[PDB]
Every structure is written in structure tokens, then in C-alpha cells.
Structure 1
Amino acid sequence: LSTSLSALPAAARDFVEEAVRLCRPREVLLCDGSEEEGKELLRGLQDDGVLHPLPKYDNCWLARTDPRDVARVESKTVLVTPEQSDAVPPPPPSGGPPQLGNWMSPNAFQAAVQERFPGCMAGRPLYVIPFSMGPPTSPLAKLGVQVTDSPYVVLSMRIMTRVGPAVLQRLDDDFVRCLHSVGRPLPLTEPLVSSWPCDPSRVLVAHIPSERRIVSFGSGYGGNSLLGKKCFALRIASRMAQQQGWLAEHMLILGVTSPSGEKRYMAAAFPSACGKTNLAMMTPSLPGWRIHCVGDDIAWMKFDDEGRLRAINPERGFFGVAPGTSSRTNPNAMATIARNTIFTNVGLRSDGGVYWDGLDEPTEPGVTYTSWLGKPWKHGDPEPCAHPNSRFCAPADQCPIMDPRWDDPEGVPIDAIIFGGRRPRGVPLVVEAFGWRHGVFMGSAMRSLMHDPFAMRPFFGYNAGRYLEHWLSTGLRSNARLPRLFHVNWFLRDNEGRFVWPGFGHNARVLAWIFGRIQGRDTARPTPIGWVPKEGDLDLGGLPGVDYSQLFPMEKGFWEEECRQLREYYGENFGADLPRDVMAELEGLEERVRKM
């Protein structure tokens, strides 16, 4: 932290001074990303009452939030574009609520800003965070400058992005301007809840792609305040990607190594698994196979000159949902969060550790708990000890299975893209698309039952129909080595209501089959919905009692209903903005189903 701003290049300096004149902070501090700066931030936050130390651990801390500020606020998150159709398709003609993004006119946006930001930082320091999304020397990296009046945001941004000398050295006119305030100018007129400043009634999270800008007011929480997280890495980046010939996606990236030493990378989009345990940190249950994590949330991907789709993880840390995390379910996540981690809204134990539903850390008898609301808590309370959206924020380099190339500036070559869903019947364990357009249709048809095309529903940066068009056009690149496209479902239930598939490390068996399909192996049989493994070409050895036929249902009634639902979904939500190729894939599926 320094009051000297001389190191900022002219455009970044102009942005900072604009924000200073608007917000009227007490002082202005440039962030340098150093260990000493982190200690200073922590000291101030503890003195402020925001952070509680967690002396059970090495350098871990706990924040609690006002209960009104605990998650992204979708209804207050908007895309600002001169033309509404650049942002979103027509509103559902039958009157249903829009589900593919919210639009705000420039006029309305500017008026909203003028009600909120003038003087909003009175009495507070403004912090300047120059940051890189991706290794700063990557040709795929993009830079930002975030100004904020929240030290909690600064600490978390330092974990989640690259903040440091390397960033300032590269900064020029081309960066995303990110303006953030918690919206609680001093002096306060009433006490805070849990020392957590916010202005819930006036929260606004706005994206203005034509101005390379994000503006966020009133929330200190996660996706609303850590402007790299979602606002930049998905919403602004997706529109940049459409304009510049790349892809910005809500996908984990993993490396899979076969027993005999070949390595392939895969990306996967899962809805409602955002922040949760996934494939990316999996300990495989097939001997000899290895899995490494490149990223577990965002993938930025671009074809190289050889036609290979290269991906980077544009983040530097994990911002994961805490409840359900345990040594049993995710030992790699547990290792990651054991030190130098900031926890938000988890329980606090009498021995100086943390608590959430599912945690299996051994504790001595008589250890007691305080909930995220700061109240005594015991098992059986109607309310959970940790808020369901409570978080850890930890550096990625602490994850024991990080891929050697996880921060390689060149990116990793992607050979498969996997879409995920959670369905108790009908949708098989794994299916491969017949080709690119068919695969784009599969991604468009994802569910979470809510539809969540490409796991991007809350995160589109521009018209979702044009996003689908952009995916289709991407497949036309000459000499592209297009990844194969798959859809998976870990969650089928048997004629007794329990899971057919054991999941967890056994999911490596599905990745192994995918791996073979990448290599061109003749290990599939055709069905109305795509290729599936031949019985015996999915490794079920060591899984006695697992019934292949219940993993690969082919139910005509299910698919007839699925097509009816998709037809209604596309009609209402995309209308004429749906690409013809997607409708053609639905029509194709309908006809194959008719004959089945």
C-alpha cells in the first residue's frame, strides 16, 4: 500500500482520479500485492472487527457478513448496452420472467450511478488494484484496474488474481475499468451488522462492455465485489471473446494422464456445481490414471495457429462453497484451505477452528460453536452453522494436484468439452455428440427443472442466442482440431431410489472412456441421442453390481417430454434469436425419437 500513484500509466491514472472525484475517499492507496501489504490489510481488518483470527490454523481468518448481503443478487445484476437486443433476446412472449440476463439502458444506468456513488467513500480509503486475469505474460491474459473501499475485497482479489509489479509493467490503455463501493459513507448513522458495510436496498452490479467497464455498488460479497470472479471473467470477457475470436466459459479444466503416459486436457461445464466439489480435484479410482487441476471455474480458450484449442485458467485462487467440504469428499480441497485461507460466513469453534455441515476435522469433546450470525449454535438448530453460500478463498498453488502447466502462459490444448447435468432418470451416464452442431445443441439443452445453457445462464455478457451463434461459428474455423463434445450425468437413480453410479473417484472410468474416444478408439454404439460406450468398453471391473442398462436408459417417453420442454424453452426464451442450427438439432432429435 502506497499513496504514490506515479507508477500507474496515464489511462489507469485517469480512471482512478475519476473515481476519486466521484466517490470522495479520505485517501488513495495503490496496492502492490506484497506479503507485507497482506499483513497490513489483515491488521486493519482485525482492528475493524471484520476478521476473526482462526488460531487453530496457519494464517487463516474468518469474516461474517450482514445477512442481507450473502450472495450474488441476480435481479440487480445488469448488462448496459445502447440497444436492448445486443444484451438479451426478446422478453418471453407469454409473460414469464427473463432468464438470460437483465438489461438496463445507458440513460437509466447513469441516473442510478448518480444516486449512489457521489460521496459514497467519504471517510474511507480508496484502494487501487491493478490485476491480471491469467499469467500476465500470456497472450490470452487480460488486465483490469479495480478501485474499491473494501479491504476485504483487496485481500480476496490478491488471492483470486495476479496483483503485482508484473501487472503495472504491462498496463496500457487496454484494461477493464472496475469501480466498486460497499455504499456506506462515513460517518455511519447506525451500527453495522457483523462490522460489514453494505447497502442492500440499492445494490447494482452493472456491465458496460462498450466502455470496457464494470460498476458495482452496495455489496461486499463474492461475485458482486470481486470483479474479476464473474463480472470480468464471464460477462465482459464473453462479449470480448465474441468480438475477438475466442471463448470465455464457465468450465473447469483438468489434465488426465493414462497409465502408459499420454496426457490429454479436458474442460467441463457443470451447473449448480459452481464453487462445489468436482472432477477438477478428483482422486481417480482407476489404478495408473492421474488427474491434475488446471482450474475449477473459468476457462478462456482460443485456437492456436495449429488449430488446437488452447485454454488458460484466468484465476489464481479458489473461491469455493464451504459446506459439504470434507477429507472424505475432497481431500485436495481440504489441503488447499488448510493455510493462508480467508473464510466467509462459516461457523467458528471454541478451539479456534471453523465449522460447516459435512466437515470431518477431528475435534476434542466439548468443542462448542458460534454460527455465521454470531449466535451460539448446536446440532439440531433449525438454521445451519455456516450459511449455505459460505466460502473459502485460497491460493491455487496450495492445491496438491495443480497441473504443472496450470499457470503456463501458452495454455493447455483441449481435446474434450463435457457438459454436465443432474437427472434421476432418462439422461445417460455419458453420451458423445455426433458432431460440432449436435454438441452445441447438447450444451444449449443443459438443465440445473431450470435450463442452464452451457452453465452460463446467470453470466451472459451479450445476447444468449448470439452466444450460441458464436459457438457454431467457432466450429467453422479452417483446420481446427475441434474437441469432441459430451454430456454426463452422475445422478441417475435405481428402481429403489438410490444412485446407480458411485461417482466421486469412479468418475475417472467415464474420463477414461472419453480419453479413448479422443484417440479414435472404436468403443461406441449409436443411439437416438448420440454415441454411448459399448457394454464392456466402459470399465466396470471392480464395480460388481453396477448395472450398465440402468446407466444407459433409452426411454422414448422421457425423450418425447424432453423435446416438448426444450421446444417451449427455446420458443419462450430465445425466439427468433435462436440459431437455425440449434432448432435443426432439436428437429433431428424429435425425428430420431419418433422412430425409436
Structure 2
Amino acid sequence: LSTSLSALPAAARDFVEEAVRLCRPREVLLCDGSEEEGKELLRGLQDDGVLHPLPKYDNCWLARTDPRDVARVESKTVLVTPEQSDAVPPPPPSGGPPQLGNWMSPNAFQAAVQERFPGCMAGRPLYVIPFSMGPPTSPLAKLGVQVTDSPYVVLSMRIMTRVGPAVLQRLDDDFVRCLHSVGRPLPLTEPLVSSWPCDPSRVLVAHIPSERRIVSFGSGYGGNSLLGKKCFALRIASRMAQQQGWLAEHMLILGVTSPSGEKRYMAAAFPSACGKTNLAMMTPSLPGWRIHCVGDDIAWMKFDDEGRLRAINPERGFFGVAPGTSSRTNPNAMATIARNTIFTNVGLRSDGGVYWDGLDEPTEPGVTYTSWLGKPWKHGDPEPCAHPNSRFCAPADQCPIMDPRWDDPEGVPIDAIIFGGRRPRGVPLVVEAFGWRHGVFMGSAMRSLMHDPFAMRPFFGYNAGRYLEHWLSTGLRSNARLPRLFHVNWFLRDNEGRFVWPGFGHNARVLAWIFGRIQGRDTARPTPIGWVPKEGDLDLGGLPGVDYSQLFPMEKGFWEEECRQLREYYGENFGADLPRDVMAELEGLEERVRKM
């Protein structure tokens, strides 16, 4: 933290001074990403009452939020473009709520800024955060400058991105301007809740791609405030990608090594509550196989000169949902979050540790709890101890299975892309697409019952139909080594309501099959929905009782209904903006189902 801004290049300096004149902060501080700066930020945050130390652990801290500021606010998140059709398809003609993004006109956007930002930082320091999305020297990396009046945001951006000097050395006119304020100028006219400033009634999270700009007001929380995380890495980036010939995706990236020494990388898009982080840092249950984590949320991908799809993880840390995390379910995540971690809205224990539903850290008898609301809590309370969207924010380099190339500037070659879902019936354990367009259809048809195409539903940066067109166009690249495309479902249930598939480390068996398919192996049989593993070619050795026929249902009734639902979904939500090739795939599936 320094008041000297002379190291900022001209365009970055211009942006900072614009924000200063608008927001009227008490002082202006340039962040350098150093260890000493982190200690300073922590001290101020503890003094402000925002952070509780967690003396059970090594340098971990707990923040709590105002109950009105606990998650991304989709209804207040908007794309700002001169033409509405550049941002979103036509409104559902039957009058249903728009579900592929919100549009705000430039006129309306500017008027909204003018109601909110003038003088919003009075009495507060403004912090300048120069940051890189990706290793700063990667050809796939992109820079930003975020200004904010939240030390909490500064601390978390330091973890989630690359911040400081090394970024400054690369900074020119080409960066994303990221303007943030909690919207609580001093003096306060009423007490805060949990020392957490916000302006919930006026929250606005705006994306202005034509201006390389993100503007976020009134929330201090994760997806709204850490502008690299979703605003930049998916919304702004997806539009850049469409214009510049790459892909910015809501995908984990992992490396899979066979017992015989070959390594393949795979990306996977999962909607919420499908075990995304459990897959990305899985400990495999097939002897000889290794899994490494490259990232568990965002993937930026571009074809190289040889036609290989190269991916980087543009983030430097994990901002993960805490509830459910345990040594039983994810020992790698437990190791990642054991030190130098900021927890938000989890429970606090009398022994100075944390608590959330599912946590299995041994604790002494007589240990007691305080909920994320600051109230005493005991098991059986109608409310959870930790908020369901409570988070850890931890450096990625603490994950024991980080891939050796997780921060390699060249990126890793992707040979499979996996779409995920959670269905009790109908959708097989694993299916491979018959080709590129068929796979793009599978991605567009993902569910979460809600539809979540490519797991991008809340994160489109431009017309979702045109994003599907971009995916189709991408497959036409001359001499591209296109990854094979798959859809997986870990969550089929049997007649008794128990899972047919044990999941977790056994998911490695599904990755092993996919690995073999990448290798050109003759291990599949055709079905109306795509290729499935032949019985015997999916390794079920050591899984006695697991019933192959239950893992690969082929139910005509289910698919007839699924087709009806998709047709209605496409018609209402994409209309004329749906690419013909996608509709053609639905029509093909319909005809194949007719003959089954």
C-alpha cells in the first residue's frame, strides 16, 4: 500500500483519477501484492471488526456479511450494450422471465451510475489493484485494474488473481477498467450489521464490453465484488473471446495420467451442486491413475499453431462453497483451506476453528458454536450454522494436487470437454457425442428443472444464441484437433432411491474410459443419444453390486419428454437466435427416439 501512483502507466492512471473525482475517497492507495501489505490489510480489517482471527489454524480469518449481502444478485446483474439484441435473445414470447441475461441501455446505465457513485467513497481509502487474469506472461493472459473501497475485496483479489509490480510492468492501454464500491460513504447514519458495509437496495453489477469496463455498486460479496471472478473471467471475457477467436468458459481443468505414463487434460462444465470441486481435486480410486488440478472454475482456451486447444486457468486461488467440505469428501480441499485462508459466513467455534454442515474436523467435547449471524448455535437449530453460500478463499498453490503446469503460460492441451448434470433418472452415467455439432447440442441441453447451457446461464456476456454460434464456428477451424465431447451424470438413483454409482474417487473410472476414447480405442457402442461404454469396457472391478444396466438406461418415455422440454425451452428462450445446427440436432434426436 502506497500513496505513490507514478508507477501506473497513463491509461491506468487516467482511470484511477476518474474514479477518484467521481467517488471522492479520503486517500488513494496503490496495492503491490506483498506479504507486508497483506498483514497491513488484515490488521485494519481486524480493527474494523470485519475479520475474526481463527487461532485454531495457521493465518486463517473469518468475515461475516449483512444478511442482505450473501450471494451474486442475478436480478441486478446487467449487460450494457447499445443494442439489446447484442446482449440477449428476444424476451420469452409467452411472458416467462428472461433467463439468459439482463440488458440495460447505456442511457439507463449512466443515469444509474449517477444516482449511486458520486461521493460514494467519502471518508474511505480508495484502493488500486493492478491485476492479471492468468500468468502475466501468458499469451492468453488479460490485465485489469480494479478500484475498490473494500479492504476485504483487496485481500481476496490478492488471493484470486496475480497482483502487483509484475502486472504494472505489462500494463498498457489494453486492460479492463473495474470500478467497485460498497456504496456506504462516511459518516454512517446507522449501525452496520456484522461490520459489513453494503447498499442492498441499490446493488448494480454492470458489464460494458464496448468500453472494456465493469462497474459494480452496493455489494461486498464474492461474485459481485471480486471483479476478476465472474464479471471479467466469464462475462467480459466471453465477448472478447467471441471477437478474438477463443473461448472463455465455466469449466474446471484437470490432468489425467494413465498407469502407463500418458497424460491427457480435460475440461468440464458443471452446473451448481454437481460436485465440480470434488471432481477437479479428486483422489482417484483406480490404482495407477493420477489426477492433477489445473483449475476448478474458469477455463480460457485458444487453438495453438498446431491446432491443439490450449487452456489456462486465469485465476490464482479458489473461492469455493464451504458447506459439504470434509476430509471424507475432499481431503485435497481440506488441505488447501487449512492455512492462509479467508472464510466468509461460516460458523465460528469456541476453540477458534470454523464450522459448516458436513465438516468432520475432530473437536473436543463441549465445543460450542456461533452462527454466521453472530448468534449462539447448536445442532438441531432450524437454520444452518454456516450460510449455504458461505465461502473459503484460498491460494491455489496450497492444493496438494495442483498440476505442474497449472500456471504454465503456454497452457495445457485439452483433449476432452465434459458436460455435467444431476438427474435421478434417464440420463446415463456417461455418453460421448457423435461429433462436434452433436456435442454443442449436448452442452446447450444441460440441466440444473432448470436449463443451464454450458453451465453459462448466469454468465453470458453477449447473446446466448450467438455464443452457441461461436461454439459451432470454433469447430470449423482448419486442422483443429477438436476435443471429444461428453455428458456425465453421477446421480442416477435406483428403485430404493439410493445412488446407482458410488461417485467420488470412483469417477476416475469414467475419466479412464474417456481417456481411452481420446486414444482411439474401440470401447463404445452406439445408442440413440450417443456412444456409451460397452459393458466390460467400463472398469467395474472392485465395484461388486454396481449394475451396468442401471448406469446406462435407454428409456424412450424419458427422451420423448426430454425432447419436448428442450423444444419448448429453445423456442421460448432463444427463438430465432438459436443456431439452425442446434435445432437440427434436437430434430435428429427426436427422430432417433421415434425409432427406439
TM-score range, shorter chain: over 0.9
Partner secondary structure for residue 163 of structure 2: coil
Partner secondary structure for residue 559 of structure 1: helix
Distance 1:123 1:275 in 2: 43
In the alignment, which residue of structure 2 is the partner of 1:62?
Answer: 62
- Count of residue pairs brought into register by the alignment: 596
Contact 2:134 / 2:314 at 8 angstroms: preserved in 1? yes
Contact 1:275 / 1:320 at 8 angstroms: preserved in 2? no
Contact 1:275 / 1:321 at 8 angstroms: preserved in 2? no
Distance 2:548 2:563 in 1: 25
In the alignment, which residue of structure 1 is the partner of 2:46?
Answer: 46
**How far does residue 165 in structure 1 lie from its aligned partner after superposition?**
1.4
Contact 1:276 / 1:320 at 8 angstroms: preserved in 2? no
- For residues 525-557 of structure 1, the C-alpha deviation after alignment (integer angstroms, 9 at most, x for no partner) is 000000000000000000000000000000000
Distance 2:274 2:98 in 1: 21
Any residues of structure 2 matched to 1:163-178 within 5 Å, and which? Answer: 163-178=163-178
Contact 1:275 / 1:319 at 8 angstroms: preserved in 2? no
Contact 1:129 / 1:154 at 8 angstroms: preserved in 2? yes
Contact 2:253 / 2:268 at 8 angstroms: preserved in 1? yes
- For residues 427-449 of structure 1, the C-alpha deviation after alignment (integer angstroms, 9 at most, x for no partner) is 00000000000000000000000
Distance 2:279 2:476 in 1: 29
Distance 1:504 1:514 in 2: 16
Distance 2:546 2:312 in 1: 36
Contact 1:442 / 1:487 at 8 angstroms: preserved in 2? yes
**How far does residue 276 in structure 1 lie from its aligned partner after superposition?**
5.4
Gaps of 5+ in 1: none
Is the alpha carbon distance of 1:130 and 1:5 closer, same or farther for their aligned partners in structure 2, counting shifts above 3 Å? same
Distance 1:340 1:497 in 2: 40
Distance 1:292 1:322 in 2: 21
Gaps of 5+ in 2: none
- For residues 312-360 of structure 1, the C-alpha deviation after alignment (integer angstroms, 9 at most, x for no partner) is 0000000000000000000000000000000000000000000000000
Distance 2:171 2:480 in 1: 32
Q: Does 1:257 align with 2:257?
A: yes
Is the alpha carbon distance of 1:276 and 1:60 closer, same or farther for their aligned partners in structure 2, counting shifts above 3 Å? farther
Contact 1:80 / 1:105 at 8 angstroms: preserved in 2? yes
Q: Does 1:555 align with 2:523?
A: no
Contact 2:274 / 2:421 at 8 angstroms: preserved in 1? no
Distance 1:563 1:204 in 2: 37
Distance 1:570 1:399 in 2: 40
**How far does residue 278 in structure 1 lie from its aligned partner after superposition?**
2.5
Distance 2:325 2:336 in 1: 11
- For residues 62-117 of structure 1, the C-alpha deviation after alignment (integer angstroms, 9 at most, x for no partner) is 00000000000000000000000000000000000000000000000000000000
- For residues 150-184 of structure 1, the C-alpha deviation after alignment (integer angstroms, 9 at most, x for no partner) is 00000000000000211000000000000000000
- For residues 29-71 of structure 1, the C-alpha deviation after alignment (integer angstroms, 9 at most, x for no partner) is 0000000000000000000000000000000000000000000
Partner secondary structure for residue 255 of structure 2: strand
Contact 2:323 / 2:357 at 8 angstroms: preserved in 1? yes
Contact 1:430 / 1:510 at 8 angstroms: preserved in 2? yes
In the alignment, which residue of structure 1 is the partner of 2:121?
Answer: 121
- For residues 14-38 of structure 1, the C-alpha deviation after alignment (integer angstroms, 9 at most, x for no partner) is 0000000000000000000000000
Distance 2:545 2:369 in 1: 42
Contact 1:529 / 1:589 at 8 angstroms: preserved in 2? yes
Is the alpha carbon distance of 1:564 and 1:272 closer, same or farther for their aligned partners in structure 2, counting shifts above 3 Å? same
Further displaced range: 266-275 or 374-383: 266-275
Distance 2:243 2:277 in 1: 33
Is the alpha carbon distance of 1:524 and 1:547 closer, same or farther for their aligned partners in structure 2, counting shifts above 3 Å? same
Distance 2:28 2:397 in 1: 31
Distance 1:517 1:273 in 2: 27
In the alignment, which residue of structure 1 is the partner of 2:502?
Answer: 502
Distance 1:356 1:60 in 2: 15
Distance 2:360 2:565 in 1: 41
Contact 2:293 / 2:403 at 8 angstroms: preserved in 1? yes
Contact 1:276 / 1:321 at 8 angstroms: preserved in 2? no
In the alignment, which residue of structure 2 is the partner of 1:399?
Answer: 399
Distance 1:594 1:357 in 2: 46
Contact 1:320 / 1:392 at 8 angstroms: preserved in 2? yes
**How far does residue 273 in structure 1 lie from its aligned partner after superposition?**
3.6
Partner secondary structure for residue 319 of structure 1: strand
Partner secondary structure for residue 443 of structure 1: helix
TM-score by length of 2: 1.00
- For residues 264-300 of structure 1, the C-alpha deviation after alignment (integer angstroms, 9 at most, x for no partner) is 0000000014895331100000000000000000000
Contact 1:253 / 1:280 at 8 angstroms: preserved in 2? yes
Distance 2:277 2:503 in 1: 12
**How far does residue 495 in structure 1 lie from its aligned partner after superposition?**
1.2
Distance 1:58 1:284 in 2: 28
Contact 2:29 / 2:126 at 8 angstroms: preserved in 1? yes
Contact 2:77 / 2:102 at 8 angstroms: preserved in 1? yes
Partner secondary structure for residue 584 of structure 2: helix
Distance 1:20 1:404 in 2: 41
Contact 1:277 / 1:325 at 8 angstroms: preserved in 2? no
Q: Tell me the C-alpha RMSD between the 2 structures.
A: 0.6
Contact 1:319 / 1:391 at 8 angstroms: preserved in 2? yes
Partner secondary structure for residue 259 of structure 1: coil
Contact 1:68 / 1:200 at 8 angstroms: preserved in 2? yes
Distance 1:529 1:160 in 2: 39
Contact 1:274 / 1:297 at 8 angstroms: preserved in 2? no
Partner secondary structure for residue 162 of structure 2: coil
Contact 1:275 / 1:297 at 8 angstroms: preserved in 2? no
Partner secondary structure for residue 434 of structure 2: coil
Contact 2:416 / 2:484 at 8 angstroms: preserved in 1? yes
Distance 2:76 2:421 in 1: 27
Partner secondary structure for residue 277 of structure 1: helix
Contact 1:246 / 1:300 at 8 angstroms: preserved in 2? yes
